[PDB]
């Protein structure tokens, strides 16, 4: 069945468009990440990582 | 002509089949807030009135 | 990540959500119960009528 | 479960699960205390015999 | 905490707080009962000695 769209129709019957971005998180090799600068490495000292 | 708030009408319905997915054509709206019952499941429930 | 878009009627904007049933979602497009994304819905009458 | 859809049915039944777990915990704690009480009388009876 | 904003992050973590508190309470109650059990055997050993 096909829709019939006309400007006479008000809200509810007025056509809508839906855009979906769907992530997925997993403990797998990450390939997408945001614009954040990397840093160097330190060893044997209590640090944040 | 819809009745004013100070005098509203009411109809009590009984002794008939309960089909509820057909009302989408005879009344324009946007929400269909069926808080109590899932709309698609009304085909099976038996109601008092 | 996945990106997609499609056009529907405005009566069922809330029908694209986990656990939503009905002919407009059961046989057209239904989300999984554990969806996690950025759903965007726009009233497209200037460009889709 | 036959009255509502899963997305809020699970919200409704979470409280039932928590309440029944609390009741079972109370029952087992009371039984443990009563058993500890009975053991002393059993030991006294053994000594008397 | 790094995944969601505070207003619903606190809602999410409230359940964790409650569950962990319940677990700790169960642990300490069991330890109290076991200690009460052990004390009787200690007293019996003292009398035998």
UniProtKB/Swiss-Prot annotation, chain C:
Integrin-binding motif: annotated segments: 9-11
Superkingdom of origin organism: Viruses
Subunit structure: Binds to host ACE2. RBD also interacts with the N-linked glycan on 'Asn-90' of ACE2. Cleavage of S generates a polybasic C-terminal sequence on S1 that binds to host Neuropilin-1 (NRP1) and Neuropilin-2 (NRP2) receptors. Interacts with host integrin alpha-5/beta-1 (ITGA5:ITGB1) and with ACE2 in complex with integrin alpha-5/beta-1 (ITGA5:ITGB1). May interact via cytoplasmic c-terminus with M protein. May interact (via N-terminus) with host bilirubin and biliverdin, thereby preventing antibody binding to the SARS-CoV-2 spike NTD via an allosteric mechanism.
Purpose: Attaches the virion to the cell membrane by interacting with host receptor, initiating the infection. The major receptor is host ACE2. When S2/S2' has been cleaved, binding to the receptor triggers direct fusion at the cell membrane. When S2/S2' has not been cleaved, binding to the receptor results in internalization of the virus by endocytosis using host TFRC and GRM2 and leading to fusion of the virion membrane with the host endosomal membrane. Alternatively, may use NRP1/NRP2 and integrin as entry receptors.
Stated name of the protein: Spike protein S1
Organism placement in taxonomy: Viruses, Riboviria, Orthornavirae, Pisuviricota, Pisoniviricetes
The encoding gene: S
């Amino acid at each position: 069945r096909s829709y019939g769209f006309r400007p006479t129709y008000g809200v509810g019957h007025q056509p809508y468009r839906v855009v979906v971005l769907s992530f997925e998180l997993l403990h797998a090799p990450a390939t997408v990440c945001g614009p954040k600068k990397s840093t160097n490495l330190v060893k044997n000292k209590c640090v944040n990582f | 002509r819809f009745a004013s708030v100070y005098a509203w009408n009411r109809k009590r319905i009984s002794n008939c089949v309960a089909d509820y997915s057909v009302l989408y054509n005879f009344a324009p709206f946007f929400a269909f807030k069926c808080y109590g019952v899932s709309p698609t499941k009304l085909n099976d429930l038996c109601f008092t009135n | 990540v996945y990106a997609d878009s499609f056009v529907i009627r405005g009566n069922e904007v809330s029908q694209i959500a986990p656990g939503q049933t009905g002919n407009i979602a059961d046989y057209n497009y239904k989300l999984p119960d554990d969806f996690t994304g950025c759903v965007i819905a726009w009233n497209s009458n200037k460009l889709d009528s | 479960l036959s009255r509502l859809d899963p997305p809020e049915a699970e919200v409704q039944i979470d409280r039932l699960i928590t309440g029944r777990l609390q009741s079972l915990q109370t029952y087992v704690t009371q039984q443990l205390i009563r058993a500890a009480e009975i053991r002393a009388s059993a030991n006294l009876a053994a000594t008397k015999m």
